Amino acid sequence: MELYLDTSDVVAVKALSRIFPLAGVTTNPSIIAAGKKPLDVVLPQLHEAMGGQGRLFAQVMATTAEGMVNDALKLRSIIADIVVKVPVTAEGLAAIKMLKAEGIPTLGTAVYGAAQGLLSALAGAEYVAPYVNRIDAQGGSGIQTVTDLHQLLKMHAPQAKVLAASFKTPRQALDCLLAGCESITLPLDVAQQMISYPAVDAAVAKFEQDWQGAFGRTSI
Amino acid sequence: MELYLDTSDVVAVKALSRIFPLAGVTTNPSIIAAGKKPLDVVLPQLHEAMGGQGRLFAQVMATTAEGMVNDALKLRSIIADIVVKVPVTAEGLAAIKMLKAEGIPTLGTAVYGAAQGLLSALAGAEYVAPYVNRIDAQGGSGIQTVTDLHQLLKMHAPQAKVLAASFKTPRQALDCLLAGCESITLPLDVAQQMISYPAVDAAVAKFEQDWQGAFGRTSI
Amino acid sequence: MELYLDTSDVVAVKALSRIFPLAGVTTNPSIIAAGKKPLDVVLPQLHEAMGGQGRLFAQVMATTAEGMVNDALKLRSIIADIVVKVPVTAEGLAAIKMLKAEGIPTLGTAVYGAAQGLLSALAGAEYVAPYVNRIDAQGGSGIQTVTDLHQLLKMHAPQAKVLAASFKTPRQALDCLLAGCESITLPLDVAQQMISYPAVDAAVAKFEQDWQGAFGRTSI
Amino acid sequence: MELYLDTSDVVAVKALSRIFPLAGVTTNPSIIAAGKKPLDVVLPQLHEAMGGQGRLFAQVMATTAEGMVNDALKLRSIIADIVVKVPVTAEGLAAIKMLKAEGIPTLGTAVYGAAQGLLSALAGAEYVAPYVNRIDAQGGSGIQTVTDLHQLLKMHAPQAKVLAASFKTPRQALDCLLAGCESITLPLDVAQQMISYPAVDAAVAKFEQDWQGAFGRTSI
Amino acid sequence: MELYLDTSDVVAVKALSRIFPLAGVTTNPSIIAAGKKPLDVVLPQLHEAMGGQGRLFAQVMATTAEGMVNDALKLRSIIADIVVKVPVTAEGLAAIKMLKAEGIPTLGTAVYGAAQGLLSALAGAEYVAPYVNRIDAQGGSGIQTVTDLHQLLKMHAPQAKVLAASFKTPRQALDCLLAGCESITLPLDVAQQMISYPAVDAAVAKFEQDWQGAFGRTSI
Amino acid sequence: MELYLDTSDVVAVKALSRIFPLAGVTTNPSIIAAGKKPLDVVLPQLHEAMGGQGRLFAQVMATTAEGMVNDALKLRSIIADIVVKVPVTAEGLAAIKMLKAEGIPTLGTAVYGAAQGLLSALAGAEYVAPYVNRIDAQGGSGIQTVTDLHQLLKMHAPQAKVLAASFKTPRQALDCLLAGCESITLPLDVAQQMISYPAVDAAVAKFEQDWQGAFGRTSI
Amino acid sequence: MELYLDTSDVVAVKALSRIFPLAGVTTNPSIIAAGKKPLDVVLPQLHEAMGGQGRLFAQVMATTAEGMVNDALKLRSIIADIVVKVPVTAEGLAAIKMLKAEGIPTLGTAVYGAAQGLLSALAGAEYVAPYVNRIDAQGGSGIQTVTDLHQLLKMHAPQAKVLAASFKTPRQALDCLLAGCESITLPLDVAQQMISYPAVDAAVAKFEQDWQGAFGRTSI
Amino acid sequence: MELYLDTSDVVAVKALSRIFPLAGVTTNPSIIAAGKKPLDVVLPQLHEAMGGQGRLFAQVMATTAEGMVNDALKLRSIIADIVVKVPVTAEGLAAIKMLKAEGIPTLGTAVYGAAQGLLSALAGAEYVAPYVNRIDAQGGSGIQTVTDLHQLLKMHAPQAKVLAASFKTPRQALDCLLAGCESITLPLDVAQQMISYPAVDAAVAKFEQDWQGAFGRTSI
Amino acid sequence: MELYLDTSDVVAVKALSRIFPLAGVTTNPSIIAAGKKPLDVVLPQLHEAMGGQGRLFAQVMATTAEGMVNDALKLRSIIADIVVKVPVTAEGLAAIKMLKAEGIPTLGTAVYGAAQGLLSALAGAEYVAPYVNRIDAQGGSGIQTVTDLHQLLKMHAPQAKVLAASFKTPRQALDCLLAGCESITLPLDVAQQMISYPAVDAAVAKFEQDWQGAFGRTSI
């Protein structure tokens, strides 16, 4: 299982590095725009924030196959081992094919259809990233869509993996993991809601209270 | 399958040693408080009660990652091979991470969510212990939660194992075992209700009665 | 839906009368033994405990048909409208039949089989009381048994109603209610865990904290 | 729901009359042969054994339509309101047509097929009696067949009712009742195992044990 | 529940009239050709073989809407109340429309699609007749096809009824009846297979045998 | 059940009027563009091809609420009783509420979400029209979406009805009808493939061939 | 089905009044605190934004039963017909009971358990408001919990209704409606996401494009 | 698969040895009482009835661990390779454990709970024998219990095997085998009901009848 | 998968040898009687129509184990490698055990019970042959029974295989194959209906019609 964060704030990334066993951080130009900082700064700083380990992900903006080819060349020049994710269109499939020919790992993003993601995987993307929240909000069923995509990948192209993103509530992440996703990423607020429970807090408080009422200190 | 006792009564565990194939005894500071005796006394006596065999478990109470690190150092000093369980918070995950770094086996306790247990397992905890009775009491469904946690473990983290606790009726234990739990623990009252059945007693009485009416004795 | 309490402590009954919309209180000779007080005292005081309202239930102890006949006569002499529960044996069936002939409402207790309860209902018992916790403890399935009993009653004897008892966790009561039970009774501890949730407490605390930080009062 | 007994022993019928709310007793020439006594003698005897109330059933033995017509005439001469059951063949359907024309109630026995029983019911039979134990013993599924027959009767001929027979264990009766059967009959051994439970006995025993431990007496 | 026969032999019809509660006899030009005799002869003879009561069905052979209009006029001239079935084409739907305009009951035959039968029913045909055996032989599934047809008729046009035909084994008839068919028809041999069971024969034989062994006589 | 056509060809409408029991014809501006003829001509001609009966539907083209109000006034001026279709946007809901205040029946089109259709139905649309084929083509599930919409309407807004459109194969229409749709519309090609089957043709051919081989003629 | 809004902005409420058929607006002290304006000022403004129609909801704040009694008195004094929501505790239960005694309609809020909401409904609350998003975030399952609550209400207390709240994604609202909720409330952003779809926008755009290509305008 | 017999009649065992591929015979002291013959006689004669092969099973009668120790010693002295069955109590588990220490194979009998049988298997008994008929008659579900026991064994203790006993009808044996039981034992009458079918007999009869019709004789 | 033919017409076997990949032909004395010719004449001719390959099957007629042993000896003397089929009785089981001791492969025929077939397979028959059509004709469920038989074989006796026979429609063969049968045999009529479809014929007709309309020839 691979755990990533969809954010670009260096301080939060470094702070949460000590908590979860991070496998890397994925970023999108929307989050980059939110952070306001230029990429040639954000990737180095975030890389140092995660201790120089893990994986990295960045997204191109071009519309023509050679255009996102050149964009991926720039990204690989900046960070040697980054994976370049590309929106899935006809040009997206093309860029995937020549990028796989060049041997640079690629990710399929903006996936709204199981057939679309399967086509991207056949073209050669090692990762496929459906937009769970957007698909769910647009009248679809992101959970079932992820299920079908996972089944198709496992039963035709084993080497491909599913990377779930676009989360708003912990439940969506729970169902995505239950569907067999090999990798997921989550935003900071959902991550915080993963590691806080009033029931857990009350249980710990009662636990310490009993220890205190018994032995007259708190420490072991 | 690993069977443990959720209690701290030396005489009780010694008496029940000849009945069930005990794999160890798990203790929590609440039960230790009920037993009123200090840990440095109860652990050696219990270890002798299992004849120097079986597994052992104790829990920290600190809030800071270094705090449960020091506590776990104390437990490993008292008992070399004892497994230390930690309440699952952000600090719990941190402590689990450096504990897996230093190579001390750990257990995840006070687990109320499948995602929480999955996070603990990814951090590296060897066992995950949800509170089935507490979850069911607080409007949740402990059985389905345990099933989901087991599925997530078998899917992403094969090396982790589920250790069910917090039982009030034999039905909960049976359901947890049917869910695929690799290890469970139970209290003395549930253990007693496990091995007693009026139907079994009546069948044995009728059986001996048949032998009596046949041969003039109940013997041989 | 009919809500009752299976206990005999006057103070607790009176205190909880202000909270739940009580329909009555059921008692059994085991609970009477626990309370240590004679019935001719406990029933009047309890009747005043919910102020002369609700329903009352008490159980016979004789084995012979005329035995619980005289018993039920004594209970009706003490409280005019009390409903008498009888254990379901052959003598129980005979007693239920001829008490239904006399026109005194009766209840079927100590029910361990759905067909047993159905036979009691055919004999004429107004209520049937399975022992869910004991059935689960003895390797059965109380929830499914209650389900079959409810289906059989709604199919053949519409006038009979299921009165669930013998609870240890609120989950059992939840499943019994979901099965279609028209009446349930529960003990004090399950009632207390029923109306308390740390999540609710934290939510209301944060709620009033926000309103306090906004305007500085504790009420409208 | 209609409860009957498939037996011919006057003493047992009278003894069990005080236990269950009997609706009558069904008889067949097999159990008549086992009882050894002639029908014209036994029939008034158990008729009085049920207190003179309830239903009665007896079977023909002829092979030709007019033959079992004459048999039914003899039975109606012996007792006015008895229901005549006939084995289901081509002659059975013809005899049932004649008997329905004469307005004498009839029952369909020896039913091994759902379609066969449905045809018998459409011919005018008020009752249909499959042989659950025999069908199960011959590699079929008595419970399934009863279910299909019940559904067919309900959704085509509402006036027909299913009368299950041929039982060896109480489970078969339980599933027949769960399938929606409006009437069942059972043998004496199944009745005795039906109304006896060691668990119930032990519960009652513990009950007056604690009553005695409280009040110096097992009595109220 | 309407029981019909799909045959054209006067002797067989009259013989089976006494056994099954016939609602009528359906005929098709194929079976009429097999019977070799002309319609103007056969229909009076079958109508008398009924005992004078029941329903009669015959089919047109024309292609043009007015053509089967004239055909249906001829059938109504021969037998006043006969119901005319028409093959379902575009011309079939047209013919059904003018026949519903003129108030002559009609039946939809040669139905291979549930939507086709729905269209016929909406056009106004009183009955719809799918060909179960042919549909099954041609790679379809007549059972589920009839199921969907029945569901559609019930939930859109309540007045239409399903009349299943084309049977080869009793199982097909059983599933058609279980699917909710209000009427079916049945060939002679498969009908014979409804009314013969070796198990029933052996049961009757043993029954008479034990009666004889007990009473030294065969008679009741 | 309401049967409609989604086309604007007068000749085809008139020709198919003799076959199916038409309840009306729905038109959309795309189909009007395909037909190339102006609306003030197409609606009168279609109405005359109707025989003067049935229902009519037309769709407005403005964006602002009073805009489609005025357009609906124009259409209702051309044909007195036409139902106005409106796209479901915020302005669509506004216009629907205004028209419901004016008491003119309205049509909800371009429904890609069950919640959107429910909102239109609450606003007052008499019918809701999802685009099954487009929802399918965009990675959704048109059949399941129609199912949820039908359930929601039957649950909360009994007066609303589902009008399925956008079909490419008769299978989609079959599933839509099975889901409980009270009205559907079909294109000409799907209608033609609907009422044609080679199996039916071959069955009719064999049928008249046998009639010929019997009587020297294929005629009655 | 009753549609409400959970917000406190007068401008947004009035703007959305023309779009959805609003049944009222619910407010909670958290949102009131966010608005920072006193309730006696805010709710007249909302009432006018309704056009003087619809329902209103406000929550009590004190702790003692008489405390929320006086609070509800104040709310009824300020707005005559306003419904009062109360957090569900023991005090909340008592408040609900005697408020039903003097006939003040009440709503059950802060519900985290189906049995808790069922108890509130038994106490007499007209509406029950579970917190779907919070329950899902805390390891539960809000959808299934709402399902059980709805089933229990329809089974035991028909007059009670479920009012879903706490939404973050359209799917939660869709599933709550599918579960049978009679009323829901909706935050502004999620409501906006109910009425915007890129698919619908593109369909409308192409629609005007073809009208343009046909008649030289997108108009008329 | 292992087939055994639960009986003690030498003649029947020898006679059935030629028919079924016997793997052994299990005996219980009740059956020994029925046979009235002493064990030191029945086991040698039964072994000779085997022809000198197969497995043998006998049960202890003592209540104290050393008591069944001595009993098992006597049985192993009598027949070297006999497997000892022990009733499952606390002393039962203690005995099972120490004979697993001594390397003598053991069987768990009188099993009424899946958890009980699983505990016996963990203690080490090679076989577990639930009482299907008794459990089923006492209001339980023998088939489901056997299924759960088999699932638990295959999940946690692969080496343990389920040995079903206590049968009354062939259906119970069929379901037990379908549940995955690796070994079953069945009584003489039920085994006879496995090897007789009237349908099979009629088929054989008709078969020789057609051979006779062909060749004037029933033989090849 | 093994494909066989249940017939004895040499001309038909020879003709169909070119079409299907025959694995052999099974014969029974019923179809032998139908062919009227003696076995010693027919079976060499069928072996020659085979092309000298495939498998052969024939049945005994004796009722005694030794008699059908002699029958099998005669068959093996005539044809070196023919497999002998024996009816499954007690004598059949004995004959199978002895024949397996002689190393001659055997088939169990006239199988009406899954337990019966499983017993034969344990006795040593290489194949098991149920009679699907007779079973479903006699009120059973041939498809389900074949399913259970296949499950039991794959569970306990891996070497046994299912050989389905007795077919009337291709649907039954389809379900038998779907159940996992490793071998099936079908009659000539079902084979002819199997490989013929009017839909296929019409598709081919349209196909070469289009080829002709394109290139002025139907040729390639």
Side-chain angles (χ1 to χ4, degrees), chain A residues 130-214:
Chain A
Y131 283 176
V132 183
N133 187 70
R134 335 288 304 292
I135 289 168
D136 196 13
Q138 289 183 37
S141 170
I143 305 311
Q144 84 84 42
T145 301
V146 161
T147 298
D148 321 296
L149 173 59
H150 184 257
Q151 295 311 298
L152 292 181
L153 292 198
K154 302 327 292 174
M155 158 296 312
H156 292 132
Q159 72 309 323
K161 296 163 292 186
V162 177
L163 200 157
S166 185
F167 290 99
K168 275 293 195 305
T169 178
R171 188 51 66 250
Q172 293 163 311
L174 173 65
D175 323 294
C176 288
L177 291 170
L178 284 170
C181 288
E182 294 74 23
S183 55
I184 57 97
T185 179
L186 42 63
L188 307 187
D189 38 359
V190 173
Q192 290 311 294
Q193 292 157 33
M194 228 63 37
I195 64 170
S196 177
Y197 305 88
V200 173
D201 307 338
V204 172
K206 164 40 50 195
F207 215 137
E208 180 286 320
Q209 284 146 32
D210 183 18
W211 207 103
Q212 231 297 327

Side-chain angles (χ1 to χ4, degrees), chain E residues 132-134 165-173 186-187 189-190 193-194, chain I residues 133 136-137 168-169 172 189 193:
Chain E
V132 185
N133 190 71
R134 336 293 307 298
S166 185
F167 291 100
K168 273 293 195 306
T169 180
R171 189 51 63 249
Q172 294 162 312
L186 170 49
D189 50 354
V190 183
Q193 291 158 33
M194 307 336 162
Chain I
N133 187 72
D136 42 52
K168 276 293 196 305
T169 180
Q172 294 161 312
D189 38 0
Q193 294 159 36

Side-chain angles (χ1 to χ4, degrees), chain I residues 18-77:
Chain I
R18 273 209 301 94
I19 298 170
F20 333 103
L22 302 182
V25 159
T26 168
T27 73
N28 59 55
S30 83
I31 51 85
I32 295 299
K36 150 72 212 70
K37 284 308 296 156
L39 76 184
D40 50 0
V41 173
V42 313
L43 46 64
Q45 299 174 318
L46 315 151
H47 188 201
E48 303 334 291
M50 285 303 195
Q53 320 313 129
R55 293 296 326 111
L56 272 174
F57 304 86
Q59 197 169 324
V60 303
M61 44 46 52
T63 87
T64 65
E66 61 291 25
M68 57 222 181
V69 162
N70 295 321
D71 284 4
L73 289 175
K74 296 315 300 170
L75 314 206
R76 150 96 57 218
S77 70

Side-chain angles (χ1 to χ4, degrees), chain B residues 61-208:
Chain B
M61 45 40 62
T63 82
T64 66
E66 58 83 34
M68 314 58 70
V69 161
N70 294 323
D71 293 7
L73 290 177
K74 298 308 304 314
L75 286 311
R76 298 283 266 191
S77 72
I78 309 306
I79 297 296
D81 58 346
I82 194 164
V83 203
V84 181
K85 81 192 66 34
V86 178
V88 176
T89 58
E91 300 310 307
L93 279 280
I96 291 329
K97 292 216 301 181
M98 319 76 59
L99 283 171
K100 295 306 300 309
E102 307 124 3
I104 295 179
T106 58
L107 183 152
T109 195
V111 169
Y112 284 71
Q116 157 200 20
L118 181 31
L119 274 174
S120 66
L122 292 159
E126 187 184 328
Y127 306 90
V128 182
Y131 290 174
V132 185
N133 189 70
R134 200 81 38 51
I135 288 169
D136 272 350
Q138 292 183 37
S141 170
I143 304 311
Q144 81 86 40
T145 300
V146 161
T147 297
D148 294 349
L149 172 61
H150 181 258
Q151 291 313 299
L152 290 175
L153 293 197
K154 303 329 293 172
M155 144 49 64
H156 299 121
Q159 293 199 301
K161 295 164 292 186
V162 176
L163 186 134
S166 185
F167 290 99
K168 275 293 196 305
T169 179
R171 189 50 63 248
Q172 294 161 313
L174 172 63
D175 292 325
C176 289
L177 289 169
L178 285 171
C181 289
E182 295 75 22
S183 56
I184 64 103
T185 183
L186 48 60
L188 303 187
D189 52 356
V190 178
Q192 286 310 292
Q193 292 157 34
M194 212 57 57
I195 62 174
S196 177
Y197 303 88
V200 173
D201 307 339
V204 171
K206 166 41 51 195
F207 221 124
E208 149 277 316

Side-chain angles (χ1 to χ4, degrees), chain G residues 110-190:
Chain G
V111 169
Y112 282 71
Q116 157 200 18
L118 193 298
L119 274 179
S120 69
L122 290 166
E126 290 56 28
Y127 306 88
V128 180
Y131 285 177
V132 184
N133 189 70
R134 332 291 313 292
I135 287 168
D136 263 34
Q138 292 184 39
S141 171
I143 305 310
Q144 83 85 42
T145 300
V146 161
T147 298
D148 322 301
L149 172 61
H150 183 259
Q151 292 313 295
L152 291 177
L153 292 198
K154 302 329 291 171
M155 144 49 64
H156 302 301
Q159 68 307 336
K161 295 164 291 186
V162 176
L163 193 151
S166 186
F167 292 101
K168 274 292 196 305
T169 178
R171 193 51 63 250
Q172 295 159 311
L174 172 62
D175 310 332
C176 285
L177 291 171
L178 285 172
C181 287
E182 293 74 22
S183 56
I184 63 102
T185 180
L186 182 45
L188 305 189
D189 39 359
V190 183

Side-chain angles (χ1 to χ4, degrees), chain F residues 132-155:
Chain F
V132 182
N133 188 73
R134 335 289 306 294
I135 290 168
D136 172 14
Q138 290 178 39
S141 176
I143 303 309
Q144 95 77 43
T145 299
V146 162
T147 299
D148 326 298
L149 169 64
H150 182 261
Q151 281 299 303
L152 290 183
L153 294 194
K154 297 330 291 172
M155 144 49 64

Side-chain angles (χ1 to χ4, degrees), chain E residues 22-98:
Chain E
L22 304 184
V25 174
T26 172
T27 65
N28 60 54
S30 290
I31 194 145
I32 291 301
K36 156 69 212 69
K37 290 323 320 311
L39 70 186
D40 48 7
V41 171
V42 303
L43 290 325
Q45 299 177 322
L46 324 189
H47 174 264
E48 301 313 315
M50 305 258 195
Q53 318 319 128
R55 291 310 322 118
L56 279 173
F57 310 118
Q59 198 165 321
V60 302
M61 38 43 57
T63 88
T64 66
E66 72 84 44
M68 308 77 47
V69 161
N70 294 321
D71 286 7
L73 290 176
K74 305 308 305 314
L75 287 311
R76 300 282 267 192
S77 73
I78 310 308
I79 267 58
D81 56 346
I82 196 161
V83 177
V84 184
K85 332 175 305 319
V86 178
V88 173
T89 57
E91 299 310 307
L93 278 277
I96 291 327
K97 291 213 296 176
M98 300 75 40

